[PDB]
């Protein structure tokens, strides 16, 4: 029945607002349904994964980020947030690839300035462990 409008934007705004109020459980329910309505929009998977990350659900988060990565191969926020989750699980080699990928996708784009510094900080911590 996807002759559904851009009431999709109304739903995204609501889920976005719930997330900023720390209502992660409610936000995740909306984001989940949005992923059902339009499985090609990457904001919905970033949102869904973010809620799972916020609630400590690392494997579920990585799963949503993986999907987002498939539909938006240029978006560095997916491997970067997955790398965070993989770090929390103590999976350092996998986290490293995540960070290196993010770094490739960010390149020297000005909008990801602070995000670059976090990436480098994490790569430096994993690097020293292998000594």
């Amino acid at each position: 029945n996807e002759i559904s409008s851009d009431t999709l934007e109304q739903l995204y705004s609501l889920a976005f607002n719930q997330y900023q109020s720390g209502k992660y459980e409610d936000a995740h329910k909306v984001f989940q349904a949005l992923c059902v309505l339009d499985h090609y929009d990457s904001r919905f998977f970033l949102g869904l994964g973010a809620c799972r990350q916020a609630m400590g659900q690392y494997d579920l988060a990585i799963h949503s980020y993986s999907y987002g990565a498939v539909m938006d191969i240029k978006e560095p926020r997916f491997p970067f947030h997955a790398a965070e989750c993989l770090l929390q699980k103590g999976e350092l080699a996998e986290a490293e690839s995540g960070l290196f990928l993010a770094q490739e996708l960010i390149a020297n784009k000005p909008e990801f300035k602070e995000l670059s510094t976090r990436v480098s900080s994490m790569l430096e911590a994993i690097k020293l462990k292998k000594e």
Partner: peptide, 9 residues
């Protein structure tokens, strides 16, 4: 510090 989402509309 939770992940930062894309802004709406």
């Amino acid at each position: 510090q939770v992940p930062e989402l894309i802004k709406p509309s």
